[PDB]
């Protein structure tokens, strides 16, 4: 049986980058020919499995980390890379073996006025452990002073929206991105 | 108060070298995307390069593809153009543009730093 | 330059004179904000428009502006002698690979 890598790519609706998804791929043929050989993902280059080997190859788990990121912030994907997604809403593991996709979404998920819906941790009081996900709504404590209620100042809330405008230009355009990761 | 201002362009031999630096001052540098686009006299506006933010998008005008190469400093609050082997049509006034969040095609400018090779 | 313009449209004092920018589907067909720029000769240009009437804080309310299809415009009504600069179109271009931002052709604007 052919497993799943058309709703996990063709999905009506990915999730944010502070809350990502995890779909185990498992018990299948996982055919990598019809995902690599196709114009549309212009960020799979990929680390540990070389790209053109993945269909010669038998993995024990499979995932698919299917989220929707800003244009620029999709270099911060990557093993070792360090930012402000890579440290708070989604963090690769240094040993990573596997292979992160991602496509241009001005189609789909920047709608005209605005699309607030896709969120982004921007404070955290630590880094993030890799693979770690933190669906939060404590209010950061950014200053001295020991808030812990409304939201004042050095008082945050961590997420904010990205604001996927259809003008806004590719550094700020949502880049929709599906991290493989292997054994 | 937006501040974009270059320094670095002067008379060079065809098939010389340059630089141009440009300057950034009251905005978030890291932010915003970075244009590089001259105006050559008697001539309209040519986009010549265009950096982003994180600089994970470097493009190129098909005259000057893979001959410039736009660096940024994202700490620095400073942009550079590394000018390299300048052809006939390169004499013009080179203007600094940066973005915005808002529409992203929104341009501020810089008074622009001359350059001309003959 | 990737975008079209006439060559320069000009006219009287008094008068209205739609400067149009027209362009290919991925430029202003794909919805971009479109910025008319106002170039005076011997000076950096200074941006005085946006969509619609997204106009900047310190310019006078003459120039507005539309769009129409894979078009736009900036209508400017009674004209004095402040008017007297190069007018440039923009968009942006997310073409694959390409991603810029595209200027226009450069009307000159005379009283």
């Known amino acids: 049986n052919l497993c799943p890598f058309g709703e996990v790519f063709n999905a009506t609706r990915f999730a944010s980058v502070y809350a990502w998804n995890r779909k185990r791929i498992s018990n299948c043929v996982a055919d990598y020919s019809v995902l690599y050989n196709s114009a549309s993902f212009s960020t799979f280059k990929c680390y540990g499995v070389s790209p053109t080997k993945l269909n010669d190859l038998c993995f024990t788990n499979v995932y698919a980390d299917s989220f929707v990121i800003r244009g620029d912030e999709v270099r911060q994907i990557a093993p070792g890379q360090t930012g402000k997604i890579a440290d708070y809403n989604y963090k690769l593991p240094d040993d990573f073996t596997g292979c992160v996709i991602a496509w241009n979404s001005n189609n789909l998920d920047s709608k005209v006025g605005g699309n607030y819906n896709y969120r982004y941790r921007l404070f955290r009081k630590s880094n993030l452990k890799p693979f770690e996900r933190d669906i939060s709504t404590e209010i950061y404590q950014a200053g001295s002073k020991p808030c812990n209620g409304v939201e004042g100042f050095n008082c945050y809330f961590p997420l904010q929206s990205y604001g996927f405008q259809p003008t806004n230009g590719v550094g700020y355009q949502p880049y929709r991105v599906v991290v493989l990761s292997f054994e | 108060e937006v501040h974009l201002v270059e320094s670095g362009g002067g008379l060079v031999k065809p098939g010389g070298s340059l630089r141009l630096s440009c300057a950034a001052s009251?905005?978030?540098?890291?932010?915003?995307?970075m244009n590089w686009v001259r105006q050559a006299p008697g001539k309209g506006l040519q986009w010549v390069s265009s950096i982003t933010g994180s600089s994970s998008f470097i493009f190129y005008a098909d005259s000057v593809k893979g001959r410039f190469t736009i660096v940024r400093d994202n700490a620095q609050n400073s942009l550079y153009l590394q000018m390299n082997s300048l052809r006939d049509e390169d004499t013009a006034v080179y203007y600094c543009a940066r973005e915005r969040d808002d529409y992203d095609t929104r341009l501020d400018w810089g008074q622009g730093t001359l350059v001309t090779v003959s | 330059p990737m975008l079209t313009q006439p060559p320069s449209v000009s006219g009287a004092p008094g008068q209205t004179v739609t400067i149009s920018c027209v362009g290919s589907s991925s430029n202003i067909g794909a919805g971009y904000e479109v910025h008319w720029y106002q170039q005076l000769p011997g000076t950096a240009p200074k941006r005085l428009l946006s969509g619609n009437s997204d106009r900047p804080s310190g310019v006078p309310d003459r120039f507005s502006g539309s769009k129409s299809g894979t078009s736009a415009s900036l209508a400017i009504t009674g004209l004095q002698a402040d008017d007297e600069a190069d007018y440039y179109c923009?968009?942006?271009?997310?073409?694959?690979?390409?991603?810029?931002?595209?200027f226009g052709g450069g009307t000159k604007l005379t009283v």
């Open positions: 009251g905005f978030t540098f890291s932010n915003y995307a």
């Open positions: 923009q968009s942006y271009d997310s073409s694959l690979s390409l991603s810029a931002v595209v």
